[PDB]
Amino acid sequence: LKLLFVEVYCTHTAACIFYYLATTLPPENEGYTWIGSLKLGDYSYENFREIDLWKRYTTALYFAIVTMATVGYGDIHAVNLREMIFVMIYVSFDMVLGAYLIGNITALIVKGSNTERFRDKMNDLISFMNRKKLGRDLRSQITGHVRLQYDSHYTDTVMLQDIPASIRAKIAQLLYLPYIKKVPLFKGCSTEFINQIVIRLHEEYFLPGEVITEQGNVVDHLYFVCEGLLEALVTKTDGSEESVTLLGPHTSFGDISIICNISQPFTVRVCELCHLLRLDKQSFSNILEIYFHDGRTILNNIMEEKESNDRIK
Amino acid sequence: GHNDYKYIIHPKNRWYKAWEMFILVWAIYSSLFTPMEFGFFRGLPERLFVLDIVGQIAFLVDIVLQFFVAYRDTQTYRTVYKPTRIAFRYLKSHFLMDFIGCFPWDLIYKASGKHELVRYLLWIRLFRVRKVVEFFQRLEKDTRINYLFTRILKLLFVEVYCTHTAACIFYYLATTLPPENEGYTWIGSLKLGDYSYENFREIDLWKRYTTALYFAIVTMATVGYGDIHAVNLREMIFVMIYVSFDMVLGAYLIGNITALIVKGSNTERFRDKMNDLISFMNRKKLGRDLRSQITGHVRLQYDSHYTDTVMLQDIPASIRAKIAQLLYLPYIKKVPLFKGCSTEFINQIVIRLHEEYFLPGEVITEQGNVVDHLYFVCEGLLEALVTKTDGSEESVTLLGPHTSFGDISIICNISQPFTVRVCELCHLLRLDKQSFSNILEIYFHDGRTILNNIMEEKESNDRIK
Amino acid sequence: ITALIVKGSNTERFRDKMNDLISFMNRKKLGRDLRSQITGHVRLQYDSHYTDTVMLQDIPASIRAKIAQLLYLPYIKKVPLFKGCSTEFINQIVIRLHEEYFLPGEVITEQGNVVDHLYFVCEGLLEALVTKTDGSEESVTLLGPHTSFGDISIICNISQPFTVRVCELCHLLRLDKQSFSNILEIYFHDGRTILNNIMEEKESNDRIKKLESDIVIHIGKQEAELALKVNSAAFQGDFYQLKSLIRSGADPNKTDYDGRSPLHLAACRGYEDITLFLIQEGVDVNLKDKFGHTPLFEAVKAGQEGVIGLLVK
């Protein structure tokens, strides 16, 4: 924008100076000036000193703007030696300044982010997927999840890796904290423990119908639903999976298997787009290796809370 | 919700896609004809009276269908199929402009006493180019065509439209002057060759349009021959505006192309590395075989696409897990370490896996280095050696495909016994020690079954003995 | 054309590297002499293709070892410091070295400094500036091509005997203390070959020959003190330090000033694992100390019946 404004000022000044150099010659020699000898169509700018001000300004600015884009129609052109020198200076300077404009626009475009980077990531991912000949539905899952990640700004976490663990912990305690309070799994805990639980959390968004974790699996991620609706399904030998509970907002799941040190009791399947905080089972464990008072208070809360659902109980 | 309210069309429904390709052609024609019928026609002649009417009808139906097609939400990201919800989207987003465009503006102009200001409303039909904008946006999603290439093609179409409209406006500005003063216009004084455009309002439509478009195109590339130039003050002002905007547009075109060349370099990166690396070999006179080894590694870097294995860290855990369950699971079965265990244990090994590729001659694990990863040789051959006190290395049994090495050291929780070497290109599937350890704790019976397989694998190779 | 120009100019990279450095130097308000030496050294680095190491960053260990054995190894094999070595040892150092080019009329190392890195001489002559009590210098050895410096201190566990002086432009070959120490513990007989060389090549060296008298003493107290560390670890119970110490070239057959073996100490203490490892070495089961105590009698004296079981075994 600064360079375009410099273009505006420079062309306006060039038009004014060019017409001025036309006026420097005495009127009797008007035939040797660029405007006094200018015959466009029928109108001949003969007594150019006595033509309407805006007609003269439009003519001079016409030339200036034309030369700025180097169209060089030639209809209006330098005739004098003073006009020759001024036009030389003007176009020589305008070359560099228009090259600066081109360079700034090109640098802007080169600094392509968001849709540009995501597009590149999509192309690389599509190539890799073709190499693995993955399931077309699973291919849709891959593409949909990363598209969601683009819209749900998953790459934000990469940026958050730059800011050190201190300010990062502050970002987490200023955002994840209410959501972690609402979850009843941590009904009673210490401030340090809850802060550590918040720090290691990672945001992730999931697409409806998908499987968060398979049943009978070594769960390595306790999740905390923030938005949307999730659910748990009881797969038997026949495959007649049965609903356990609609994992609504603030319904932590995977903690049962994690604390019980058992396999995933129920396949966790998605119903709507869900925002989930994530905590690696290992991380929750190491925080338990320190604040085990907190963990046994959980264990009591596990008793009383799981009493609610007979499937969970 | 698509059953809840019928007649609703899916956003990517097949018939709607066909109608999109049809209304896209009509939108291109309407946006490329409105400037023509505006500038070159002070009243559309009856010869094309049908062709305009049908045109509006073509969009009139589209005004109705867009009131039934569903739209994917930007909040729940889910397609919403409710006419109550669907209609509001049109009524707010673009219904006004499309509806104003659909009026018989030419007929209204001819039915109001030939008032030009009424004909100025014809430019509302230029907003039908939003269809072409949507088409280009959708094409950008397709990985078939580069995003920057789509950008440059969009900019080329922008130049096409801008030059066409500029030529039409230029001829219109020529027509605004009265015929008796036609000599003051840009066209009424044109004397190209022996042909003078004296009575320019009576020339054939295509000769006039080609002259105006010749001006527009030669000024688009700023060739500025000067044969056709602005003469009026309205013509001067319009040429200044067009020239400035086209300077900006051409700068953007050069920027898009330059960014496509700079950023969009895939094998050129390997070539750039080759440049200075070949300089290295040449200034140091490396053996041709060693030169081949280095070039093989660099090509390998672009041929192993480890980046295509790094991406999986970004895909979430479960979906990555199913990728593993469909690819690494055969390789997992091939392992003699697992052999016959519970399908669940095998599946958990499958889930947590990190595919890697290595280079011939380069070594992978070192003697005395605490094992941190459990490697399966899936497609390749691998050979370990142990440096003694004198220094000579101790050859061991080679690790051919469908085997698992480093497992014993992980089981004993001891450093890597022998410095292992990559003989050639190997599909070295990797399992972290901690993941395998947790999997073993959950599946203790499978763990003991592995222990049996382990004793058999111990007698299998005397170096593990 | 823009991409060709923006791919970076080898000089522009150098200029950018230099600028950044100079900005740091002025930011720290540095002095002219040091600035000139720094800028010159950056110069010699860039035109001698310092970035080759950067290029060598990506090609793996085997190929890097091969190019090393094709460039450095012919030059290293002509260095008498490593004549008599197993060729394996020489090639190993050759994997772990770094060429460096210094400006004429300079200095790297300083008499009495911590040696850290070790240096060879691929080409050029160097002057062994040994600062006296008054402050003057005398060169008792001229380090020409296929010579070495820094070795005297590392291999003999002293500090550098000399402030080395760069007589002219010189390409030398760097070997870190820590890596050299690794490769030196890997090999044993040729490490003693090093030591013997360091003695026999100390002939031209004269003030380093008084250093060499102290070096005779240094080999003496090195093996003695090494044995004392082995015995002290045996008594203390640091089995891990026992392993590391024996892997530092320690002789399990060495006894301390009381003619007491580390086996003896572990026997009287009862550390049957230290005893067992020194057994794996093969220390005499029937050795007698100055006081007549045998590892057997050492074990029986303190009632170390487990150690007695290992001993009778």
Residue numbers in the entry:
A (entry chain C): 202 to 514
B (entry chain B): 50 to 514
C (entry chain D): 306 to 618
Quoted passage from the original study:
The potassium ion efflux channel GORK plays a critical role in closing plant leaf stomata by releasing K+ from guard cells to reduce guard cell volume and turgor. The GUARD CELL OUTWARD-RECTIFYING K+ (GORK) channel is expressed in Arabidopsis guard cells and encodes a K+out channel. Voltage-dependent K+ channels, including GORK, contain three regions: an intracellular N-terminal region, a transmembrane region, and an intracellular C-terminal region (27–30).
As a result, five different structures of GORK ranging from the transmembrane region to the C-terminal ANK (designated as GORKWT1–GORKWT5) were determined at resolutions of 3.16 to 3.27 Å. The five GORK structures showed N-terminally an almost uniform transmembrane domain (positions 50 to 313 from the initial Met), including the voltage-sensing domain and the ion selectivity filter. Closer inspection of the structure revealed that the difference of the degree of bending in the C-linker between Mol I and Mol II was small in GORKWT1 but greater in GORKWT5. Additionally, GORKWT1 displayed a C4-like C2 symmetry in the CNBD, whereas GORKWT5 showed a pronounced C2 symmetry. Thus, the rigidity provided by the α-helix in the CNBD–Ankyrin bridge apparently contributed to the stability toward a C4 symmetry in the C-linker and the CNBD.
